[PDB]
Amino acid sequence: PSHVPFLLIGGGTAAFAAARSIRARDPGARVLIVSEDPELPYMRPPLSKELWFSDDPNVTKTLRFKQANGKERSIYFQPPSFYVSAQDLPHIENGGVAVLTGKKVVQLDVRDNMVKLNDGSQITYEKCLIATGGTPRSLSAIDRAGAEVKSRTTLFRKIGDFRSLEKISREVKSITIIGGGFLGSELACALGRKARALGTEVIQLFPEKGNMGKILPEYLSNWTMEKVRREGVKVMPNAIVQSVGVSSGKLLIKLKDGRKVETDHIVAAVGLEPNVELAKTGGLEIDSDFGGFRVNAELQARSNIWVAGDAACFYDIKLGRRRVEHHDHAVVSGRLAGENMTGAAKPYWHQSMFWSDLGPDVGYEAIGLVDSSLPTVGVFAKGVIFYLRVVVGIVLWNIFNRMPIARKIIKDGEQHEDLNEVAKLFNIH
Amino acid sequence: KAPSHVPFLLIGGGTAAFAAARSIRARDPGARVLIVSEDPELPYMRPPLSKELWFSDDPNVTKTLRFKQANGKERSIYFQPPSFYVSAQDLPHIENGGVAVLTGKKVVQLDVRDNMVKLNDGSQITYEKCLIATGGTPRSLSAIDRAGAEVKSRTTLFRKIGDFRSLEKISREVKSITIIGGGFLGSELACALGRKARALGTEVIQLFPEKGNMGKILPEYLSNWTMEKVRREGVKVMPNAIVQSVGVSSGKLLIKLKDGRKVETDHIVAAVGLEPNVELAKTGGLEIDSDFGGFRVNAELQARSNIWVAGDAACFYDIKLGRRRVEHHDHAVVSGRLAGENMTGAAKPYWHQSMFWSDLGPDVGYEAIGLVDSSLPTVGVFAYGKGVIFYLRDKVVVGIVLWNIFNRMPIARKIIKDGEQHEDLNEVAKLFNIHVLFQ
Ligand SMILES: Cc1cc2nc3c(=O)[nH]c(=O)nc-3n(C[C@H](O)[C@H](O)[C@H](O)COP(=O)(O)OP(=O)(O)OC[C@H]3O[C@@H](n4cnc5c(N)ncnc54)[C@H](O)[C@@H]3O)c2cc1C
Ligand SMILES: Cc1cc2nc3c(=O)[nH]c(=O)nc-3n(C[C@H](O)[C@H](O)[C@H](O)COP(=O)(O)OP(=O)(O)OC[C@H]3O[C@@H](n4cnc5c(N)ncnc54)[C@H](O)[C@@H]3O)c2cc1C
Ligand SMILES: Nc1ccnc2ccccc12
Ligand SMILES: Nc1ccnc2ccccc12
CA–CA gap between residue A16 and residue A24 (Å, rounded) = 12
Question: Crossing angle for the helix pair A218-229 and A182-198, nearest 10 degrees?
Answer: 20
**Chain B residue with minimal CA distance to A111?**
B348
Experimental method: X-ray
Q: Give A301's contacts (C-beta < 8 A, 6+ positions apart).
A: A130, A284, A285, A293, A294, A295, A307, B298
User: What distance, in Å, lies between the first and last C-alpha atoms of chain A?
Assistant: 60
CB A392 within 8 A of CB A410: yes
CATH 3.30.390.30, applies to B353-435 = yes
Choosing among A305, A315, A319, A341, which should be mutated to test the B contact, i.e. which has the most B CBs within 10 A? A315
Q: After which residues is chain B broken (C to N over 2.5 A)?
A: 383, 435
| Nearest atom in ligand 4 to B185's CA | 9
CB B194 within 8 A of CB B227: no
**Under an 8 A CB cutoff, do B349 and A283 touch?**
yes
Pick from A189, A356, A362 the residue to mutate for probing ligand 3's pocket: most ligand atoms within 8 Å of its CB.
Answer: A356
Q: What is the DSSP letter of A427?
A: T
Pure H helices in A175-262: 182-198, 218-229
**Nearest Cα residue to A241 out of A214, A273, A284, A203:** A203
Out of B285, B305, B319, closest to residue A317 by CB? B285
**Chain A residue with minimal CA distance to B282?**
A317
List residues of chain B with CB under 8 Å from any CB of chain A.
285, 287, 296, 298-300, 302-306, 317, 319, 323, 342, 347, 349
CB B429 within 8 A of CB B411: no
CATH of A1-42+81-136+272-350, one of 2.40.50.100, 2.40.30.110, 3.50.50.60, 3.40.30.10: 3.50.50.60
**Nearest Cα residue to B277 out of B106, B409, B85:** B106
CA–CA gap between residue A95 and residue A26 (Å, rounded) = 10
CA–CA gap between residue B439 and residue B38 (Å, rounded) = 44
CA–CA gap between residue A12 and residue B6 (Å, rounded) = 42
- CATH 3.50.50.60 location in chain B: 1-44+83-138+274-352, 45-82+139-273
- Establish whether residue A310 lines the binding site of ligand 1, counting it when its CB lies within 6 angstroms of any ligand atom: yes
Q: Which residues are registered as beta bridge partners of B325? A: B315
**Under an 8 A CB cutoff, do B347 and A285 touch?**
no
**Nearest Cα residue to A189 out of A47, A354, A360, A327:** A360
Could you write out the DSSP letters of every residue in A253-320? EEETTS-EEEESEEEE---EEE--THHHHHT--B-TTT-SEE--TTSEEETTEEE-GGGEEEEETTTE
Q: What is the DSSP letter of A46?
A: G
Pure H helices in B110-183: 142-145, 149-153, 161-171
Phi, psi of B180 (to 5 degrees): -110, 110
CA–CA gap between residue B187 and residue A66 (Å, rounded) = 76
CB B59 within 8 A of CB B125: no
Per-residue burial over A335-345, b = 16 or more CB atoms within 10 Å of its CB, e = otherwise: bbbbbbbbeee
Q: Give B95's contacts (C-beta < 8 A, 6+ positions apart).
A: none
Phi, psi of A289 (to 5 degrees): -80, -50
CA–CA gap between residue B416 and residue B428 (Å, rounded) = 12
- Establish whether residue A131 lines the binding site of ligand 1, counting it when its CB lies within 6 angstroms of any ligand atom: yes
Q: What is the 3-state secondary structure (H, E, C) of B239-297?
A: CCCCEEEEEEECCEEEEEECCCCEEEECEEEECCCEEECCCHHHHHCCCECCCCCCEEC
How many angstroms separate the alpha carbon of residue B135 from the centre of ligand 4? 13
Q: Give B361's contacts (C-beta < 8 A, 6+ positions apart).
A: B191, B194, B195, B229, B230, B233
Taking the CA atoms of residue A175, residue A176, residue A180 and residue A182 in that order, the dihedral angle to the nearest 10 degrees is -20
How many angstroms separate the alpha carbon of residue B26 from the centre of ligand 2? 23
- Establish whether residue B328 lines the binding site of ligand 4, counting it when its CB lies within 6 angstroms of any ligand atom: yes
CB A304 within 8 A of CB A128: yes
Contacts of A283 in chain B (CB under 8 A): 299, 319, 349
CA–CA gap between residue B421 and residue B432 (Å, rounded) = 18
CB A17 within 8 A of CB A42: no
Distance of CA B397 to the CA centre of its chain: 24
Q: Are β-strands A265-268 and A153-155 bridged in parallel, bridged antiparallel, or unpaired? A: parallel
Q: In Å, how far are A8, B5, B111, B332 from B34, measured between CA atoms?
A: 38, 10, 17, 18
**Nearest Cα residue to A50 out of A189, A204, A169:** A189
Residue A380, amino acid: F
Choosing among B112, B128, B295, B305, which should be mutated to test the A contact, i.e. which has the most A CBs within 10 A? B305
CA–CA gap between residue B134 and residue B274 (Å, rounded) = 12
β strands within B319-416, DSSP E:
322-325, 355-359, 365-370, 378-382, 387-393, 396-403
Distance of CA B378 to the CA centre of its chain: 24
Q: Are β-strands B252-257 and B243-249 bridged in parallel, bridged antiparallel, or unpaired? A: antiparallel
Q: How many CB atoms lie within 10 A of CB B419?
A: 11
- Establish whether residue B138 lines the binding site of ligand 2, counting it when its CB lies within 6 angstroms of any ligand atom: no
CB A271 within 8 A of CB A265: no
Phi, psi of A410 (to 5 degrees): -70, -40
CA–CA gap between residue A275 and residue B63 (Å, rounded) = 61
Residue A238, amino acid: N
**Under an 8 A CB cutoff, do A285 and B317 touch?**
yes
Q: Give A276's contacts (C-beta < 8 A, 6+ positions apart).
A: A132, A284, A286, A291, A292, A293, A311
Q: In Å, how far are A284, B16, B383, B408 from B434, measured between CA atoms?
A: 38, 35, 6, 12
Residue B200: which H helix or E strand, with range?
helix B184-200
Q: Give A285's contacts (C-beta < 8 A, 6+ positions apart).
A: A279, A293, A294, A301, B298, B299, B317, B323
Could you write out the DSSP letters of every residue in B24-60? HHHHSTT-EEEEEESSSSPSB-SGGGGTGGGS-S-TT
CA–CA gap between residue B217 and residue B51 (Å, rounded) = 19
- Establish whether residue B185 lines the binding site of ligand 4, counting it when its CB lies within 6 angstroms of any ligand atom: yes
Pure H helices in B298-431: 329-342, 409-418, 425-430
**Nearest Cα residue to A23 out of A342, A388, A249:** A342
- Minimum-distance ligand to the CA of B332? 2
CB B399 within 8 A of CB B388: no
Out of B299, B300, B305, closest to residue A298 by CB? B305
Phi, psi of B266 (to 5 degrees): -100, -30
What fold is seen in the domain B45-82+139-273?
FAD/NAD(P)-binding domain (3.50.50)
Out of B287, B300, B304, closest to residue A321 by CB? B287
- Minimum-distance ligand to the CA of B10? 2
Sign of the C-alpha dihedral computed for residues B340, B346, B350 and B353 taken in this order: negative
**Nearest Cα residue to A173 out of A197, A205, A202, A204:** A202
| Nearest atom in ligand 2 to B136's CA | 30
CA–CA gap between residue B294 and residue B289 (Å, rounded) = 6
Query: Hey, whose CA ends up nearest to atom 9 of ligand 3?
Result: A183
Helix (H, G, I), strand (E, B) or coil at B15: helix
Helix (H, G, I), strand (E, B) or coil at B128: strand
Question: Crossing angle for the helix pair A13-25 and A327-340, nearest 10 degrees?
Answer: 30
- Establish whether residue B188 lines the binding site of ligand 4, counting it when its CB lies within 6 angstroms of any ligand atom: yes
What burial class does residue A374 get, using C-beta atoms within 10 Å of its C-beta: 0-12 exposed, 13-18 middle, 19+ buried? middle
CB A33 within 8 A of CB A97: yes
CA–CA gap between residue B248 and residue B260 (Å, rounded) = 17
CB A305 within 8 A of CB A128: yes
CA A227-A228-A233 angle, to 5 degrees, is 135
Residue B297, amino acid: V
How many angstroms separate the alpha carbon of residue B329 from the centre of ligand 4? 8
Residue A159: which H helix or E strand, with range?
helix A159-169
Q: Give B59's contacts (C-beta < 8 A, 6+ positions apart).
A: none
CA–CA gap between residue A41 and residue A396 (Å, rounded) = 29
CB A278 within 8 A of CB A107: yes
Query: Hey, whose CA ends up nearest to atom 20 of ligand 1?
Result: A327
- Establish whether residue A335 lines the binding site of ligand 1, counting it when its CB lies within 6 angstroms of any ligand atom: no
Considering only CA atoms, give the Rg of chain A. Answer: 22
- Interface A-B, measured as beta-carbon pairs within 8 A, has a size of 43
CB A41 within 8 A of CB A16: yes
**Nearest Cα residue to A323 out of A276, A277, A259:** A276
CATH 3.20.10.10, applies to B1-44+83-138+274-352 = no
Report the length, in residues, of chain A.
Answer: 429
CA B310-B78-B303 angle, to 5 degrees, is 10
Give B100→chain A minimum CA distance, Å: 28
Query: Hey, whose CA ends up nearest to atom 11 of ligand 3?
Result: A182
Distance of CA A75 to the CA centre of its chain: 14
β strands within B79-123, DSSP E:
98-103, 107-111, 116-119
Could you write out the DSSP letters of every residue in A341-396? TTT----S-S--EEEEE-SSS-EEEEEE---TTS-EEEEE--EEEEEE--EEEEEE
- CATH class of the structural domain A43-80+137-271: alpha beta
CA–CA gap between residue A396 and residue A386 (Å, rounded) = 9
Residue B304: which H helix or E strand, with range?
strand B302-304
| Nearest atom in ligand 4 to B328's CA | 4
Out of B305, B342, B347, closest to residue A345 by CB? B305
- CATH 3.30.390.30 location in chain B: 353-435
- Establish whether residue A89 lines the binding site of ligand 1, counting it when its CB lies within 6 angstroms of any ligand atom: no
Q: Which residues are registered as beta bridge partners of B359? A: B365
List residues of chain A with CB under 8 Å from any CB of chain B.
110, 283, 285, 294, 296-298, 300-304, 315, 317, 321, 340, 345, 347
Q: Which residues are registered as beta bridge partners of B378? A: B391
Give B315→chain A minimum CA distance, Å: 13
